[PDB]
Each structure stands twice: as C-alpha cells, then as structure tokens.
Amino acid sequence: MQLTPFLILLRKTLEQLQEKDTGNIFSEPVPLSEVPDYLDHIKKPMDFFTMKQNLEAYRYLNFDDFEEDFNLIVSNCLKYNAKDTIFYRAAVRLREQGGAVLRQARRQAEKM
Numbered sequence: 850m851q852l853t854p855f856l857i858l859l860r861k862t863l864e865q866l867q868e869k870d871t872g873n874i875f876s877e878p879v880p881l882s883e884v885p886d887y888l889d890h891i892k893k894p895m896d897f898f899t900m901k902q903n904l905e906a907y908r909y910l911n912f913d914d915f916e917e918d919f920n921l922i923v924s925n926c927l928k929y930n931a932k933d934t935i936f937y938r939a940a941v942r943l944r945e946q947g948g949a950v951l952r953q954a955r956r957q958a959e960k961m
C-alpha cells in the first residue's frame with residue numbers, strides 16, 4: 850500500500866466528517882479563554898483542525914489511529930458537557946453520522 854493514495858483518502862474522509870459538524874463546534878480546539886477549566890477534565894483535547902495538522906505530520910499511517918482521534922472529539926464532548934446540553938447531543942449526532950462516514954472510508958482503504 851502506497852502512502853499518497855491513503856493520505857488522499859484520509860483528507861477526503863476528514864472533509865466528510867467536518868461536513869457532519871454543521872454547527873462547526875468541533876472544527877477548532879475548545880477555546881480555553883472561554884472554557885478555562887477544560888484541561889482539568891480533558892487530558893487529550895482534539896478537534897478537526899488539529900486532526901488536519903496531525904494528518905499532514907504523518908501521524909495517521911493507518912485507519913485506526915485516524916479514527917482514534919475522531920473518537921476523542923466525541924468522547925471529550927460527552928465527558929465534559931452535561932447530558933441536557935446542545936454540545937452533548939451534537940457529539941451523539943457526530944458519533945452516529947461520523948461512524949457511517951468512517952465505515953465506508955475504511956472499506957475503501959481495505960481495497961488498497
């Protein structure tokens with residue numbers, strides 16, 4: 850398996866995941882200026898912009914590690930936010946819609 854087609858697939862998949870985040874609440878790191886206690890509870894923050902940086906820094910050489918950082922976006926949000934919030938429901942919706950995107954992308958990868 851050659852590296853450039855795989856990275857092309859991951860770039861497309863990250864764009865498709867970002868599209869499911871129609872509110873753009875997962876596109877950038879959670880702003881500590883507004884949420885100063887965020888790092889007290891969340892030990893590995895993650896967001897789609899950071900994922901894009903990691904992608905280009907070759908830190909995703911297999912689908913599992915890509916999907917792991919996507920799962921962090923979801924679990925950080927379920928963890929920090931109360932169940933009755935918009936943020937929490939948005940993470941539940943991203944988990945569902947994002948899982949479908951990831952499953953189709955993984956089959957594409959498995960064909961390479």
Ligand SMILES: Cc1nc(C)c(C(=O)Nc2ccc(Oc3ccc(Cl)cc3)nc2)o1
Pocket residue numbers: 874875879880883884926929930936
């Ligand atoms: C996935 C997730 N978990 C959390 C806890 C958050 C989160 O707090 N997001 C967030 C916070 C602030 C902000 O900008 C402003 C919003 C309102 C005003 Cl008045 C000024 C700036 N934009 C996004 O996102």
